[PDB]
């Protein structure tokens, strides 16, 4: 829950999951970039954010 993470400010769990490549779902109202480039998808930019 991104709201709980922002309220508490404790990033240990998310940091450990991101460093260990553990599949997760960050839940919360988020803005997103719309990217129509196929080359961007092949380059796997979505995983770099």
């Amino acid at each position: 829950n991104l709201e709980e993470l922002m309220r508490t400010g404790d990033y240990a769990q998310i940091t450990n999951m991101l460093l260990n490549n553990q599949p997760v779902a960050l839940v919360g109202a988020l803005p997103f970039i719309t990217d129509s480039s196929v080359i961007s998808l092949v380059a796997k930019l979505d995983a770099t954010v």
């Binding site: 508490t8 400010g9 404790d10 990033y11």
Partner: protein
């Protein structure tokens, strides 16, 4: 290193060398240096960057 010292001078210098006050420092030591009740307080986020 080789040194020339009177036995009394050697005694003093050897005591200084053998009884230095410096201890190995690491992140565990610093983390335990923080008071234990502040490390358990969820209102404070402590990180070792």
């Amino acid at each position: 290193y080789p040194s020339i010292l009177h036995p009394i001078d050697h005694a003093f210098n050897e005591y200084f060398l053998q009884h230095q006050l410096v201890e190995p420092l690491n992140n565990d030591i610093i983390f335990n240096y923080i008071p234990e009740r502040i490390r358990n307080d969820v209102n404070y986020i402590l990180n070792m960057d």
